[PDB]
């Protein structure tokens, strides 16, 4: 029964509540007797569930809060392209994308910081960029600055509309709870319009604008000689010369004579030799196929015409012998709790973001991205990290659903109740797996690290010694190299040259080549499996044991965020679902940090490097990965100690900021250790003595000062531990790759 239900003018728009803080909560609204009130104000600002219990009030805040968030992203995205318009070398970069490095940031001639605007290239003095926005605009067919200047103003205009929306909705026209609960209507709309039509539209831009323009640009024509996009639409003579399939018109589409469009809807599946990047026609045929699949898929659900599926009926009818009632009650949990929806969306979105990073490096989808190793490395590293954070957030809100929104009446002998009733077996076996892998993933390094020191290189786990080869992956590789012909016959070249095939060379660089898998990759892939399993153990344990444990029978009453539940029973320290998330983040950081290290050294040693006319590929680090990555000292020597030479020696040059942020990052990491190792008890007694000196000199504060709370001290530490950690490798990855 889809319907638009709205409440008119629930909440006014006065500036009164701005002045008095803590309006959202009653405890904070009383007054700030203590400095912990300040920290609690921020920690409870987005805890709408604590402010009120009416789901209408919660959902209205959430739906409007999203709009204010989009304005921030649009202002950001519009801000990036604006810098490309005014302060940049993009117009000059198109003339020579292989000799001019991309820059869009300029720092003013104030104290000593004009050095950062070095000779990046093209007569422009600016900071070199690694986000890859230059390659995106070329994929968008943007060839002049005024074109970019127009798009930036459009984003700022779009920002006000989103901003106007959240005001209009929370204050003037607030939807009721029924408007959000019609799930079946929501999913049809997003799949078909937001994803389907949005994909179908982008196919139009690629076919009409990007593919023709880029087909002229790689040919060798000057940038000024390229016609504008509207010129292609009006004058069809120019379009037919490149893609003669358009001469037939739209009649082959309706008559199902779709082969006439083969020129610009190809299935080559390889990279463009001229510009390192996938073919625009292949990308053009991409979104058209995606849109039809999405448009069709979204009609599955009923949305108030009797035709379609009810998700409740799908889930309930998937019972089985082993699972008692199957998926019964999950629809009720997901329709009565925002945290459950947030946990599912975060977890799979994070895994998606990691899945993007692996596709992009092997299948570079933009022109000249592969030759820019700096953009390629930071791009992979970026999304790899963002996906790791979002996955951990999924476990947190998964546990928050348990303490706050779990209904035992609904979850009775269902798939979830049955999972909690054997949680001991889930963790005890996952405990066994984590120990098994940590021994047989890291112990093999120690055996190699120990043997090479003893002068016994024959007894190692190396390619000449006992080698454990990854036969399973090498088998899967050959199937992809042979997909040209046989299975997937119409494809001319494989989906990626990473699986195998011939080498591709752009200028003097190499875009991609076969990534051979040896003993080193067999070990590192297990190291990843080891580190991934442990954070799952930490996070999954918090979800199941948040309600109760053998130690604590009533853990839900204390809440999701409680420090200890006392010092007895031995010690109940960090027993909450919150503290599991706190611990899992360190392991998320540990696991994710080896992935990018596996990426950096392998791609530099095996893949990237200058290429000669005869095909001789002079790799960057000289193929040292196979015989050095098997030992821990090899990474310390060949990866960290050696490649960090550019960072420390960056002083007196344009990359000096990276050497500073690199060194400064170690500080914040160590500053984290104040809060993790210490405890609130010592610090409150220190403040006591300091308060005496103020009471002496009559500088005593009315707001009585107290040390930080326990969970805050843990939160403050992990924030520093990760910020100081990530910023370190951030500068090392940047300064090293930018020099080479």
């Amino acid at each position: 029964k889809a319907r638009v239900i709205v409440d008119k003018d629930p909440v006014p728009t006065s500036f009164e509540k701005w002045a008095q803080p803590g309006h959202f909560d009653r405890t904070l609204a009383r007054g700030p007797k203590t400095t912990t009130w300040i920290w609690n104000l921020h920690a409870l600002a987005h805890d709408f569930d604590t402010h009120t219990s009416d789901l209408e009030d919660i959902s209205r805040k959430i739906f409007a809060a999203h709009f204010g968030h989009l304005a921030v992203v649009t202002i950001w995205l519009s801000g990036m392209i604006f810098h490309g318009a005014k302060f940049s070398n993009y117009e000059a970069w198109l003339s020579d994308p292989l000799n001019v490095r991309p820059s869009a940031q300029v720092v003013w001639p104030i104290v000593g910081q004009d050095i950062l605007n070095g000779d990046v290239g093209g007569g422009f003095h600016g900071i070199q960029i690694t986000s890859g926005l230059f390659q995106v605009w070329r994929g968008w067919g943007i060839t002049n600055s005024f074109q970019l200047y127009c798009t930036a103003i459009g984003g700022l205009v779009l920002a006000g509309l989103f901003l106007f929306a959240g005001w209009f909705h929370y204050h003037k026209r607030a939807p009721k709870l029924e408007w959000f609960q019609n799930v079946e209507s929501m999913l049809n709309h997003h799949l078909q319009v937001l994803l389907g039509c949005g994909s179908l539209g982008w196919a139009g831009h690629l076919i009409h604008v990007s593919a023709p323009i880029n087909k002229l640009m790689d040919a060798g024509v000057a940038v000024k000689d390229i016609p504008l996009p509207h010129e292609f639409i009006l004058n069809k003579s120019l379009l037919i010369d490149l893609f003669p399939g358009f001469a037939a018109g739209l009649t082959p589409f309706f008559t199902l004579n779709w082969g006439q469009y083969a020129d610009f809807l190809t299935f080559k599946g390889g990279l463009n030799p001229v510009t390192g990047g996938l073919w625009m026609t292949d990308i053009a045929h991409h979104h058209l196929a995606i849109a039809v699949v999405f448009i069709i898929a979204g009609h599955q659900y009923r949305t108030n015409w009797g035709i379609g599926h009810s998700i409740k009926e799908i889930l309930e009818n998937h019972k089985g012998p082993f699972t008692g009632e199957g998926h019964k009650g999950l629809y009720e949990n997901l329709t009565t709790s925002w945290h459950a929806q947030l946990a599912t969306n975060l977890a799979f979105l994070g895994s998606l973001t990691i899945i993007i990073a692996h596709h992009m490096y092997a299948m570079p989808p933009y022109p000249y991205l592969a030759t820019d190793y700096a953009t390629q490395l930071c791009i992979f590293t970026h999304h790899i990290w963002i996906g790791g954070f979002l996955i951990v957030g999924g476990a947190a809100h998964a546990a928050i659903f348990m303490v706050r929104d779990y209904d035992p009446v609904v979850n009775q002998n269902n798939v979830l109740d049955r999972v909690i009733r054997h949680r001991d077996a889930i963790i005890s076996h996952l405990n066994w797996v984590c120990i098994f892998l940590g021994f047989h993933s890291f112990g093999l390094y120690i055996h190699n690290d120990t043997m090479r020191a003893l002068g016994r290189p024959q007894d190692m786990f190396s390619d000449t010694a006992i080698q454990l080869q990854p036969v399973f992956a090498q088998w899967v590789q050959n199937l992809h190299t042979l997909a040209p012909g046989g299975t997937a016959p119409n494809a001319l070249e494989p989906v990626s040259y990473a699986f195998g095939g011939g080498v591709l060379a752009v200028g003097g660089k190499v875009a991609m080549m076969p990534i051979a898998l040896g003993t080193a990759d067999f070990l590192i892939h297990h190291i990843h499996a080891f580190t991934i399993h442990v954070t799952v153990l930490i996070l999954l344990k918090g979800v199941l044991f948040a309600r109760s444990s053998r130690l604590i029978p009533d853990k839900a009453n204390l809440g999701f965020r409680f420090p200890c539940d006392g010092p007895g029973r031995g010690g109940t320290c960090q027993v909450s679902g919150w503290d599991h998330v706190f611990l899992g983040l360190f392991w998320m950081y540990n696991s994710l940090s080896i992935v990018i290290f596996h990426f950096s050294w392998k791609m530099q040693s095996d893949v990237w490097g200058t290429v000669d006319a005869a095909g001789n590929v002079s790799h960057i680090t000289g193929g040292n990965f196979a015989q050095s990555a098997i030992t821990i000292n090899g990474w310390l020597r060949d990866f960290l100690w050696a490649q960090a030479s550019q960072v420390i020696n960056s002083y007196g040059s344009a990359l000096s900021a990276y050497g500073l942020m690199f060194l400064g990052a170690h500080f914040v990491w160590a500053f984290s250790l104040m809060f993790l190792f210490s405890g609130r008890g010592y610090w409150q007694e220190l403040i006591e003595s300091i308060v005496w000196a103020h009471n002496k000199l009559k500088v005593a504060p009315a707001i009585q000062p107290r040390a930080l709370s326990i969970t805050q001290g843990r939160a403050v530490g992990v924030a520093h531990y990760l910020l100081g950690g990530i910023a370190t490798t951030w500068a090392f990855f940047h300064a090293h790759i930018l020099s080479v």
């Binding site: 001991d424 077996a425 963790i427 005890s428 076996h429 405990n431 930490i538 344990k541 044991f545 444990s549 053998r550 130690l551 200890c564 539940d565 010092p567 029973r569 031995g570 010690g571 109940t572 320290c573 960090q574 027993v575 503290d579 599991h580 611990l583 360190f586 250790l673 993790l676 190792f677 530490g717």
Partner: protein
């Protein structure tokens, strides 16, 4: 680990291992005499700092001696 990670996480973890060992077929024959429990709060502080110190002492001695011995000043 002993500094950052504190007891209450580990005791619950050990309780699962107690379940499996008591409910596994063949290792059910053998059983602890003293009940296994997580290290106390003060103990983990003791174990953690010795680890902090022993690592601190050793890895600098290696650097102090090897750097000086290799060059011999």
């Amino acid at each position: 680990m002993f500094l950052i990670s504190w007891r209450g996480y580990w005791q619950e973890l050990i309780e699962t291992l107690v379940w499996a060992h008591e409910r596994t077929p063949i290792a059910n024959l053998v059983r602890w005499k003293d009940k296994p429990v997580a290290l106390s709060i003060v103990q983990a502080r003791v174990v953690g700092l010795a680890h902090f110190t022993v690592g601190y002492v050793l890895t600098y001695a290696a650097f102090l001696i090897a750097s000086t011995a290799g060059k011999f000043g």
